[PDB]
Amino acid sequence: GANKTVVVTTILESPYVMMKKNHEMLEGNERYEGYCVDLAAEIAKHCGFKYKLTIVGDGKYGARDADTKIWNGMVGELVYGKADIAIAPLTITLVREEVIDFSKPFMSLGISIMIKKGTPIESAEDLSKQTEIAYGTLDSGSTKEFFRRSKIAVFDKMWTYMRSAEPSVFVRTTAEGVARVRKSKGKYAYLLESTMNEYIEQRKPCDTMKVGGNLDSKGYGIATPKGSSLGNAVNLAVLKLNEQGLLDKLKNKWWYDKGECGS
Amino acid sequence: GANKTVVVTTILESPYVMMKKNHEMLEGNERYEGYCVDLAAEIAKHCGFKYKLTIVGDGKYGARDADTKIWNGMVGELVYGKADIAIAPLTITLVREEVIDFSKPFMSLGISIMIKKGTPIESAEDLSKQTEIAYGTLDSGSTKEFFRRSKIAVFDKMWTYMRSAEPSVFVRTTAEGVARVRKSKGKYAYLLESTMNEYIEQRKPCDTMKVGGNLDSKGYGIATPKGSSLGNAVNLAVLKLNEQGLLDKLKNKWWYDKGECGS
Ligand SMILES: CN(O)C(=O)CC[C@H](C[C@H](N)C(=O)O)C(=O)O
Ligand SMILES: CN(O)C(=O)CC[C@H](C[C@H](N)C(=O)O)C(=O)O
Ligand SMILES: [Li+]
Ligand SMILES: [Li+]
């Protein structure tokens, strides 16, 4: 049949996708800005399609409920045919790869530790061996699921600590995790993806830092429904943009070029 | 039909695949050791196949001749049906992705600079702005092709320099590049993948170092013929091994655990 506008699902998460300050004076895709908005434009230009940016209804990335077997988040929107492509900081994981297609990664990351400056922690092992400095994750997403599933001794110990710690060490949003680090006088550390950690380190009031090595190594990928014809072209576009240096240019644009914490 | 032994193509390159010192007393897959030998065993165990390690006949990774349009190297062995899978430090590139299937990356790398300790170079830009310290690449492979194709100003300038430099700055093997760095009294820098650079930095006589940031960011993938049914299982195996921490364990084993240059 005739070409149709491609429905893109994404999520509001700075600096990936944000509503522009003047969004009420704008329409359609022009309401949004950020790394993933720019990436979507480049992918569409290379693949030759028109598209519509939509925001995932349930605000989730993608997991399958053990009881109902239903996929939520952006993964669910692809699985159930509500969107054609997801362009977002969506981690490539085994269980997601079983149900949707992913491009090769467009950005690398690992789980990492965010501390308030001056907190005496240098590694995951350091955290795991103590309780005075509380630590936790989001209550949803691949970072939480990493800990919940891990059989690596240090990480399994961290998960057991997080489940049993009081008061709750879990947060609902990135903003809440960052605020908790900033307001807890060195007594809370937040486990999050290194990409986000690096972004926040360059935001005022410049009081956080990423410490130690990353806990794992993985990537974000562009996702499509399993078997979608769109997958091949989008993957080739990611590879081309990477080779051209354009993915690095976009990370620099949104993370560092207008960093607020000096040069 | 009945299951058949899977033909794996790979290449002799330390520390990925090496003939064991006592190889003449051994047979079959047991003749070989290294990171990729261990990785092959893990992939086969997860996917449930038997396999035979074979060494690529022409000693190349994979490129298409502009005149004959024939693919060489491990990519060629897959394209022409001489092997079922390639398990090697084979860089995922756009032009290769067009003709074979790749897993998600099992190892990250970027092009990097190897110097003899004490050489006054800290970046690609530094190299590009001078000629007293000669610099070059292998005469075959993705690093060479990166420079040949780049439209990034610094890298295009480096390529023009390399093509016109005398005596020739190209080398035929990794061993020749490393020897040239070691023997040139600080007057040769070798451009190579960061993985290899990091390996050599931990080998006696401990006189090289990796300097500056990487020039690009990419990955090695397990390759199969386009459309091969084996691709799905192998990709899921890579993702599982990564999540379990086993890829990092294997890199540590072959790069650092028996490093020769201290702790
Ligand atoms: C960058 N961004 O995505 C965030 O920080 C949000 C929380 C991520 C989601 C994760 N990428 C997923 O795909 O599940 C996490 O689980 O850490
Ligand atoms: C690790 N190993 O692979 C080497 O050092 C050999 C040379 C690599 C080959 C490259 N991975 C390819 O896939 O073409 C290079 O072009 O730098
Ligand atoms: Li998939
Ligand atoms: Li491919």
Curated annotation (Swiss-Prot), chains A, B:
Binding site for L-glutamate: P89, T91, R96, S142, T143, E193
Modified residues annotated as Phosphoserine in this record: S150, S184
Tissue-by-tissue expression: Detected in forebrain. Detected in dendrites of neuronal cells. Expressed in the pyramidal cell layers of CA1 and CA3 and in the granule cell layer of the dentate gyrus.
Site (Crucial to convey clamshell closure to channel opening): I121
Posttranslational modification: Palmitoylated. Depalmitoylated upon L-glutamate stimulation. Ubiquitinated by RNF167, leading to its degradation.
Family assignment from sequence similarity: Belongs to the glutamate-gated ion channel (TC 1.A.10.1) family. GRIA2 subfamily.
Record note on quaternary structure: Homotetramer or heterotetramer of pore-forming glutamate receptor subunits. Tetramers may be formed by the dimerization of dimers. May interact with MPP4. Forms a ternary complex with GRIP1 and CSPG4. Interacts with ATAD1 in an ATP-dependent manner. ATAD1-catalyzed ATP hydrolysis disrupts binding to ATAD1 and to GRIP1 and leads to AMPAR complex disassembly. Interacts with GRIP2. Interacts with GRIP1. Interacts with NSF via its C-terminus. Interacts with CACNG2, PICK1 and GRIP2. Interacts with GRIA1 and SYNDIG1. Part of a complex containing GRIA2, NSF and NAPA and/or NAPB.
Note: The postsynaptic actions of L-glutamate are mediated by a variety of receptors that are named according to their selective agonists. This receptor binds AMPA (quisqualate) > L-glutamate > kainate.
Name by which UniProt lists this protein: Glutamate receptor 2
Natural source organism: Rattus norvegicus
